Design an enzyme around this catalytic site. Structure first.
Site, PDB file in Angstrom:
ATOM      1  N   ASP A 267     -23.121  18.999  25.933  1.00 42.65           N
ATOM      2  CA  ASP A 267     -23.219  17.739  26.665  1.00 42.65           C
ATOM      3  C   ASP A 267     -24.043  17.881  27.939  1.00 42.65           C
ATOM      4  OD1 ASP A 267     -21.398  16.373  24.794  1.00 42.65           O
ATOM      5  OD2 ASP A 267     -19.843  17.611  25.734  1.00 42.65           O
TER       6      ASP A 267
ATOM      7  N   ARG B  52     -11.983  21.854  40.366  1.00 43.08           N
ATOM      8  CA  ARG B  52     -12.973  20.781  40.450  1.00 43.08           C
ATOM      9  C   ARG B  52     -13.528  20.571  41.859  1.00 43.08           C
ATOM     10  NH1 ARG B  52     -13.160  22.264  35.872  1.00 43.08           N
ATOM     11  NH2 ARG B  52     -12.833  20.806  34.134  1.00 43.08           N
TER      12      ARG B  52
ATOM     13  N   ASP C 225     -11.170  14.321  35.698  1.00 43.74           N
ATOM     14  CA  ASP C 225     -12.135  15.177  36.383  1.00 43.74           C
ATOM     15  C   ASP C 225     -13.218  14.357  37.071  1.00 43.74           C
ATOM     16  OD1 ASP C 225     -10.949  17.655  35.991  1.00 43.74           O
ATOM     17  OD2 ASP C 225     -12.018  18.073  34.121  1.00 43.74           O
TER      18      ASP C 225
ATOM     19  N   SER D 174      -9.911  20.370  23.272  1.00 44.00           N
ATOM     20  CA  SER D 174     -10.713  20.345  24.481  1.00 44.00           C
ATOM     21  C   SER D 174     -10.101  21.328  25.474  1.00 44.00           C
ATOM     22  CB  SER D 174     -10.751  18.922  25.035  1.00 44.00           C
ATOM     23  OG  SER D 174     -11.374  18.870  26.292  1.00 44.00           O
TER      24      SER D 174
END
Ligand SMILES: Nc1ncnc2c1ncn2[C@@H]1O[C@H](COP(=O)(O)OP(=O)(O)NP(=O)(O)O)[C@@H](O)[C@H]1O
Ligand SMILES: Nc1ncnc2c1ncn2[C@@H]1O[C@H](COP(=O)(O)OP(=O)(O)NP(=O)(O)O)[C@@H](O)[C@H]1O
Ligand SMILES: Nc1ncnc2c1ncn2[C@@H]1O[C@H](COP(=O)(O)OP(=O)(O)NP(=O)(O)O)[C@@H](O)[C@H]1O
Ligand SMILES: Nc1ncnc2c1ncn2[C@@H]1O[C@H](COP(=O)(O)OP(=O)(O)NP(=O)(O)O)[C@@H](O)[C@H]1O
Ligand SMILES: NC(=[NH2+])NCCC[C@H](N)C(=O)O
Ligand SMILES: NC(=[NH2+])NCCC[C@H](N)C(=O)O
Ligand SMILES: NC(=[NH2+])NCCC[C@H](N)C(=O)O
Ligand SMILES: NC(=[NH2+])NCCC[C@H](N)C(=O)O
Ligand SMILES: [Mg+2]
Ligand SMILES: [Mg+2]
Ligand SMILES: [Mg+2]
Ligand SMILES: [Mg+2]
Lengths: 388, 390, 390, 390
Positions: free
Chosen positions: A14, A94, A123, A175
Site C-alpha cells: 500500500d 504511532r 492509527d 492484519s
C-alpha cells in the site's frame, strides 16, 4: 504549492503504490520516504531500496528502538496503564513515527506529509493528532481517504500498472503490527468474538501446551520505576526487552484476546502478544505495592485509565500528558529494588521482592469510633432504616 | 446493666474463652453464641456444642451461604472491583456476620454484642462499622482490645483456669479465613515479602506443576451481570461456585500473592485462593466488553476502586454503597450472554463469547472527526509555535 | 425515498427559508414544522402561522415547559452539575427538542428530520446524537452543513426568490437562546474576552447597580432534592421557576460571563443569565451539606463533572446517563428540608436551613484515630530519614 | 529518655499560656521553649513572646513566616484551585507550616518532645500530629487538652491564677476564631445552629453588603505561571498583594462563606469564613485557566481539585501524594500568564476583561465528527430497537 511530500513508509504494497499515486495527484511532487526501525524485524535495507525503486527521491531509515524504549515504553511502564484494563497499548509507536516524519519533513522543506493508515481505524487519528501538535502548518495527505483503490486486488492491479513488483503470495489472514513491545493481530476470522483464537495466530509466544515443564526464575532490578538489569546483568532497555520477550515468550506468557472500543466508535476483536511487557507490568506493580504509601498508590491507580485513554487516542504530544508524566515521575522516585519471578506455563508467579525503600515492616478503638462516627450518626437519624 | 451479650463465635480457642471472660467482666451476664455458615467447611454442630459446653446459654447456627452469594458476592461480581487492583475481597463476609449477629441480638434483647477480631487488623473495623450502621444503640465488646491475654500460651493458661478444653492440634502456621469465595493466608513466615510462598500454604488450589495436561472447557451463561448456568446446567449460586471452585482449583487457577495496604495503616503480605472468583471475574469482564458502550464501560471502570475500597473498609451498610449499587445495576441490565473459557495450567483462556445484546457488528466521516478531535491540539501548537511536549 | 420531512422550527428567517430549500432538494417533499414552547416567551401563534405561510403542510406547537422542568431541569438540579465549574447548561433543552421532533415524526410517517443548528456549534451534535439514540432509522438533514447560504444577506436574497417574508427588524447583535431556565448570549462583540460585557446584553436580570436597596428573603422547601414550595406556597415546577426568576432577576442574581470549551474544538465567550437556577443550586448545595454523609457527598461531588460533560455534549439519551441518574436518585432520598436565603445586590446569602434528616448535631478516641490515620506517614518518614517534601 | 526539654507551639491564648506551667509540673525539671509563628494574625507578637517568658518559658522564638506561607502554601493552593467540599478556602493550610517551624526549632534545640494546644475535638490536632510524624517520627508529641483535668475556660482561669499567669477580666469571646493573611474563621457559640442566620457581630474584615461603596472598583491582576505578581500595574510581593487585595475586596463586602462542612474527626460543623483576596484570586485564576488551558487539561485538572482540597483539609501536606499533585499542577500552570480585570462591587466579583499572550481563544468536518461521535449511540439504539432511556 505541494512540491515535496514526506511519506511514512512501511514497505507494504500500500505505501509502495502511494509513491506513484502521490506523484500523480500532485504534479511534479517529489516524495521522500521515512522508515522507522521499531523492532518489526524486517529487512529495512530492502524496504529502503523498494521505496527508491518505487519512485522516492530519498528514503530515510531511522533506528528508533532505543528512543522508543526510553521515551515511550519506559513512561508507559511507569504509568501502569492498560487500556480498558486489558490492552498493552503497542500503538504507542504511532506518535514516535509521526515525530520522526515531522522532524525529517522540516529538514527537507516539504510542503506536506502523508501516511498509509486506513480510513476506518485508530492509527489515522494518532498520526494526524501528532502531526498537528508538532507542526500545525504541514498539510496532511491520507491516500486511503482520497483514492479509488478499494481492495487488495485493486492495489495489485495499480501496482503492476506503475512498475511496482507484486509477486504471488496469498493475502495475510490477519492484519498485524509488530514492534519491540508487542505483536497485534486483528481482522479476518478474528473479527467474530464467538470463535476461539485460531491456532496459526501467535508469532512470538508459545502456546501453553508446548511450554517448558520446568519453571524459569528471572530477577529484575528496577531503578525509579524502570528495569535496569536482568538476572544480575545490566542491560540496555532494548537488550532487556529482547531477552525478556524471548524468555517469557518461550513460557507462553502475555497473550491477550480482547474486544476493545475503538476511538472511531466501533468495537474490534484483537489478539495481542507482549511477553516482556506482561512481566515488566507485573514486577512494576509488585514494587509499587511495596514502596508507595496507600494514598499515593490509590491516587496513582485512579489515573491509569486517563493515561491509557490518552495513549490509545494518540494524544501523546499534549500538555495533559506532560502533566501526568510529572505526577508519575514523583511517584516513581523510590520504586527501586529487586523482583524475582517464576515464569511457567503462561503464569508469572511472584517469587520474592525487596527494596531499600520498602514500607513493609488502645489506638484501634479510637480509630474505629471516629472512622465509624458518621455511620453511627446516620443510623441514629434514620432509625429503623435499612441499606437495601 | 449488661445482662445479655451476643457473641460472634467462630469456634476457635479464643472465642471459646471469651465466653467465661465475658461472664466474668459483666457479672451475671448470659452469653448467646452466633455461628455463621459461610462455607468454611467445618463441623458446625461440633462448634455449636462447644459454644454450649463453654458456657453459652444458646448457640445459633445460621446457614447464610445462599444469601452471602446472592446479596454480597453477586453485587461484587457485577462491580468488577479488586482492592488495589489485586485482592478479591473475601472479607466481604464481615458485614454479613455482623448483620446476623445484630438480628439475633435484637431478637434476644441483648444489651451488647461481642466479636473476637484482633486489635491490629481490619476485621474489627468491618464488624464495628457494620454494627453501628445497623444498631447504633448496641454496646460493642472486643475482648482482644480489653483483656490481658497476649499469646496463645496465655490463652491456654486462661482456658485451663476456666474449664475450657484446649484442642490437641495447634494453631495453623498461618492465620486463615475460608468461605465459599476464597481462602486467605497471612502471618507467620508469610510476613516476609522477600520469600516465595511456602509449599504448605495452598488448601483448595493445585500447584501449577500438578495440574492436568489437558485443558478443560467451561461455558458460563450470565443474566444481568451474574452467572446462572455452568456447562448448560442451571445452578444455584452456591452450587455454581462450588463446581467452578473445584474445576478451576484442579487447574491451578486464581492464586494471588500480594502486599496490600491495611486500613489500620500498615502493609501485610497475603496469599489468596479464589478459583471460581477468578473465572467469574474474567467472564464478566469479557461480557461487559461486548455489551457496554465505551462511555459506560469507562465510567464504570473508574468507579471500581471506589467500590473496592468501600468493601475493604467495611462500609457495606452505607448510603454510599446503595448509590453505587444503583449505578452498577443499570449498567448490568444487558450483560447477558454466554462465555466459553479454557482452564489450563493456571490460565483462563478466552474460547468465545456471544450475547443477544452484543454491540460488536465512511471514509469521509473520518477526516471530519480527525480534524475536530485534533482541533484543540492544532490551536495549542499554533499559539506555542515551535514548542515541544517534553 | 424522502417524501416527508419534519423540521425543528424556531421561526427565524433561517428555518423559514429551509422549508422551500428542503422542498427543492428533496423533490416535492412535504415538510411539517415542530415548534416547542420551552419558555422563550415568543408569539408561538405567529411562529406557527409563519411556518404554514412558508410552505409547511402542518405546524405543531407543543407546550413542553412542564416536561422540561420535571424531566430535565429537576435531574440537573439534583446532580449539582456545572460545566467546567461555571455553566448552568441551559442547552439541556436540545435533547427534549429532538425528543418531540422524533415523537411527532413517528406519528406522521416522516422519512427524515431536519434542524437549523449551524455547522460550527454544539447544538448540531446535541440534536443528532439524540436523534440517533431515539430513532436510528430516521435520516437527518442539516441545511447549514449542505447549502450555499453563508450570510444573512444571502439568506435574504434566497427568501426573496422563494416567497419568504423578511422581517423588518434586523438580526439581534448577539446569538441568543432563551427558555424557562436561562438566557444565553454569544457572538458579535462578545467574542472578544478582553472587553467587559456591553450594557445592552442582559434581558431578564437587573444590573447590580440597579437592584433594590432592601434585601428579600425567600424560603425554599425541598423534597428528595427538588424544590416544591416557595415562601410557604406549593408551586408547580414551572410556576416556581417563573416566580424565582422574577425575584432573583430583580436582585441582579445569576449572571455568568465565561469562556468555555466547545465540544467541536474551540473556545467561546458566553453570557448566561439564570437567576432561579443560581438560587436553586445554592439551596440544593446547602441542603446536601446538611443531609449527606461525608463519603456520599465526596463521591457525588466527584461525579458532577461527568454529568455536566454528558449534558453539554448532548449525550442525555444514553445508558451512561441512566446509570448516573440512578446513583443520584439514591443520594437525594433524604435531601428534604427548608432553606432560607437573602437575595441582595447580586448575592445569595444563607439565612438558615433545617431538615428532619439533618446529620448535624471523647478526647480518648482522638488520640487513637490520629495515630492510626498518621501511621503510614510515620512509617514513610522513618524509611526516608532526613528527607523532605519539597 | 527523660523529657528534659519540650518545644511548645505557643499562640498567646490563655490555654497555651497555662500549658507552660502544666508541662513543667507534669515533666519534672523540663524546660519549655515557646515557638510563636507570625502568619498575619495581626497580634502583638513581642507581647506574646514576653508573656511566654513571663509564664516560665526558657526561650521564646517568634518566627516571621508570612512570606513563606504565601509563596510555599497559598501560591500552590491558588494554583490548585481547590475548595474543600466546593465551599471552603482552607485557611487551616497554616497548620503544617506551624508544625514545620516547631519541628525545626525542636531539632535545633535537641528537645525530647513537642507540644501543641489544639483541642481534642477538632481537626487541628490531626493536622499538627500528622505533620510532626511526617517530619520527625522520633519526636514524642504532647497534647495537654487530651491529658489534663482542665475542662472549661473558668477552670483554665483558676489554674492560671494558681500559677501566676495574668488573667484580667475580659469576657469570653462569643466565637472561636482563627486569623491569618489568607482568611478569618469563626465557629462555635450560636453559630453551631445552622437554622439561624449569621449574627451581625461575626465579621471582622469584610463589610456587610449594605454598607459597601456605591461605586464599583476596578482591580487589574497580572499573573505569571498561575500566581499573581502585580496589582493595578504595580509589582507587589505576595504578602503586600494579599494585604492590599484583602483591604479592597473586604471594603466591597466580598468573600464571606457561611457553610456546613464535614470534619475529618467525623462530624459536621457550621463555620463562617472571610477571605476577600482569596475569593478574588480564585476568580481571576479560574478565568485565566479557562483562556489558557486546553479542554482536556482543564477537565483533568478540575477532576483533581477535590483530591487536593481533601489532602489540605486533612493535614496531609507533608506527603509524597502532595508532591506528585504539585508536580502535575505546576506543568498545567506554565502558560497561565496574563492580565485579568475585575470589578469589585457590593459583594460581587464581576469579570471586566482578560488577556494572555498564551490565550487559546481565537462545514464538511462537522458531519463526520457528528457521525463518529454518535456512532456508538446509533449502534446501541439499533441493538436495543425502540428502547427508551428512562
Ligand atoms: N515502521 C514504520 N515506519 C514508517 N511508517 C510506518 C511504520 N509502521 C507504520 N507506518 C505507517 O503507518 C501506516 C499504518 O501502518 P500499517 O497498519 O502497518 O499499514 P501497512 O504497513 O501500510 N500495511 P500492512 O502490510 O498490512 O502491514 C503505514 O501505512 C505507514 O504510513
Ligand atoms: N463464621 C463465623 N461465624 C461467626 N463469627 C465469625 C465467623 N467467622 C469469623 N467470626 C468472628 O470474627 C472473628 C475474627 O475471625 P478470625 O480471624 O477467624 O478469628 P478466630 O476465629 O477467633 N481465630 P482463629 O482460630 O486463629 O481463626 C472471630 O473471632 C469471630 O468473632
Ligand atoms: N423552541 C424550539 N422549537 C423547535 N426547534 C427549535 C427550538 N429552539 C431551537 N430549535 C431548533 O434549533 C436550531 C438552532 O437554534 P438557534 O440557534 O436558535 O437558531 P435559529 O433559531 O434558527 N436562529 P436565530 O434567529 O439567530 O435564533 C433552530 O434552527 C431549530 O432547528
Ligand atoms: N501563630 C501560631 N504560632 C504558634 N502556634 C500556634 C499559632 N496558631 C496556633 N498555634 C497552635 O495551634 C493551637 C490551636 O490554635 P487555636 O485554635 O488558635 O487555639 P488557642 O490559640 O490555644 N486559643 P484561642 O485564644 O481561643 O484562639 C494553639 O494552641 C497553638 O498550639
Ligand atoms: N495498523 C495496525 N494493524 N494497528 C494495530 C491496532 C492495534 C489496536 N487495535 C490499537 O488500535 O491500538
Ligand atoms: N481474620 C482474618 N484472617 N481475616 C483475613 C484478612 C484478609 C485480608 N488481609 C483482608 O483484610 O481482607
Ligand atoms: N444556538 C444557541 N444560541 N445555543 C446556545 C449555546 C450556549 C452554550 N455555548 C452551549 O453550547 O450550551
Ligand atoms: N482552631 C481553629 N479555630 N481553627 C479553625 C477551623 C476552621 C475549619 N473548621 C477547619 O477545620 O479548617
Ligand atoms: Mg505494516
Ligand atoms: Mg477463624
Ligand atoms: Mg433561535
Ligand atoms: Mg488562637
Amino acid at each position: 504549492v505541494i512540491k515535496k511530500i514526506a511519506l511514512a513508509y512501511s514497505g507494504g504494497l500500500d505505501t509502495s503504490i502511494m509513491i506513484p499515486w502521490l506523484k500523480e495527484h500532485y504534479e511534479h511532487a517529489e516524495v521522500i520516504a521515512v522508515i522507522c526501525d521499531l523492532g518489526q524485524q524486517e529487512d529495512l535495507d530492502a524496504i529502503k531500496n523498494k521505496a527508491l525503486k518505487s519512485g522516492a527521491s530519498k528514503a530515510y531509515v531511522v533506528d528508533v528502538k532505543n528512543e522508543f524504549a526510553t521515551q515511550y515504553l519506559w513512561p508507559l511502564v511507569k504509568s501502569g496503564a492498560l487500556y480498558e484494563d486489558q490492552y498493552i497499548l503497542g500503538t504507542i509507536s504511532r506518535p514516535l513515527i509521526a515525530q520522526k516524519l515531522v522532524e525529517i519533513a522540516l529538514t527537507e522543506q516539504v510542503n506536506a506529509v502523508a501516511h498509509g493508515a486506513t480510513g476506518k481505524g485508530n492509527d489515522q487519528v494518532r498520526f494526524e493528532y501528532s502531526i498537528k501538535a508538532l507542526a500545525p502548518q504541514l498539510e496532511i495527505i491520507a491516500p486511503w481517504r482520497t483514492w479509488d483503490i478499494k481492495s487488495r486486488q485493486e492495489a495489485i492491479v495499480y501496482a503492476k500498472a506503475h512498475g511496482i513488483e507484486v509477486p504471488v503470495t496469498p493475502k495475510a489472514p490477519y492484519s498485524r503490527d509488530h514492534n519491540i513491545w508487542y505483536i497485534s493481530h486483528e481482522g479476518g476470522v478474528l473479527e467474530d468474538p464467538s470463535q476461539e483464537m485460531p491456532n496459526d495466530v501467535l508469532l512470538m509466544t508459545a502456546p501453553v501446551s508446548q511450554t517448558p515443564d520446568e519453571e524459569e526464575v528471572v530477577v529484575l532490578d528496577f531503578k525509579k520505576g524502570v528495569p535496569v538489569a536482568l538476572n544480575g546483568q545490566e542491560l540496555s532497555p532494548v537488550d532487556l526487552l529482547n531477552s525478556l520477550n524471548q524468555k517469557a515468550g518461550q513460557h507462553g506468557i502475555g497473550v491477550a484476546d480482547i474486544v476493545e472500543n475503538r476511538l472511531v466508535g466501533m468495537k474490534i476483536r484483537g489478539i495481542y502478544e507482549a511477553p516482556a511487557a506482561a512481566v515488566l507490568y507485573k514486577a512494576h506493580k509488585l514494587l509499587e505495592s511495596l514502596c508507595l504509601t496507600r494514598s499515593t498508590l490509590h491516587l496513582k491507580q485512579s489515573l491509569q485509565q486517563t493515561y491509557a485513554n490518552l495513549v490509545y487516542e494518540g494524544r501523546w504530544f499534549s500538555q495533559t500528558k506532560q502533566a501526568l508524566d510529572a505526577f508519575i515521575d514523583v511517584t516513581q522516585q523510590h520504586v527501586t529494588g529487586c523482583v524475582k519471578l517464576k515464569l511457567f506455563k503462561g503464569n508469572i508467579i511472584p517469587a520474592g521482592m525487596h527494596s531499600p525503600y520498602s514500607l513493609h515492616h488502645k489506638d484501634a478503638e479510637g480509630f474505629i469510633n471516629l472512622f465509624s462516627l458518621s455511620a453511627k450518626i446516620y443510623s441514629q437519624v434514620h432509625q429503623g432504616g435499612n441499606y437495601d
